[PDB]
Amino acid sequence: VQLVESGGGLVQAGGSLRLSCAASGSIFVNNAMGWYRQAPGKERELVAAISASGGSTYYADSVKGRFTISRDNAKNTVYLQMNSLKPEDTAVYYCAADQDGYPYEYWGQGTQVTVSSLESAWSH
Numbered sequence: 679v680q681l682v683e684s685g686g687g688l689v690q691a692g693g694s695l696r697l698s699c700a701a702s703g704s705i706f707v708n709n710a711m712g713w714y715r716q717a718p719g720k721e722r723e724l725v726a727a728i729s730a731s732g733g734s735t736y737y738a739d740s741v742k743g744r745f746t747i748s749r750d751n752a753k754n755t756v757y758l759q760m761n762s763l764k765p766e767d768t769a770v771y772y773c774a775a776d777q778d779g780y781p782y783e784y785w786g787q788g789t790q791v792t793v794s795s796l797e798s799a800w801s802h
Contacts, residue, residue, distance in 0.1 A: 679703040679784045681773050686789035689763050691796060697758040699773030699786055709776040711749055711756040712736075714785070715769035725771070726758060740766070765795045 712727035726747035770788040
């Protein structure tokens with residue numbers, strides 16, 4: 679079972695970025711998938727999760743209304759559309775997919791997202 683995140687990089691505060699994650703090696707349509715992040719110096723946190731059918735979602739309080747999770751079961755992919763990004767959203771983002779039985783969850787290797795503050799928006 680393997681997961682690979684696509685997308686990442688630098689965005690100016692207020693901007694948007696879409697992350698994707700594709701899974702291989704088993705059936706994923708019957709289990710939840712999601713995204714965690716580890717901001718500098720912080721504990722890793724569950725950012726968003728989505729049920730097998732897509733009919734239920736979960737968001738961390740600090741991203742509600744700004745991030746949207748969705749999935750394409752035919753591609754075994756999960757997406758994180760990040761809008762209204764803020765510098766506090768700077769983190770390594772890890773996709774995850776659940777399965778029945780130990781080890782219960784697989785994690786991707788992570789992708790860096792960096793959101794620049796206004797101090798960098800002009801030369802001074």
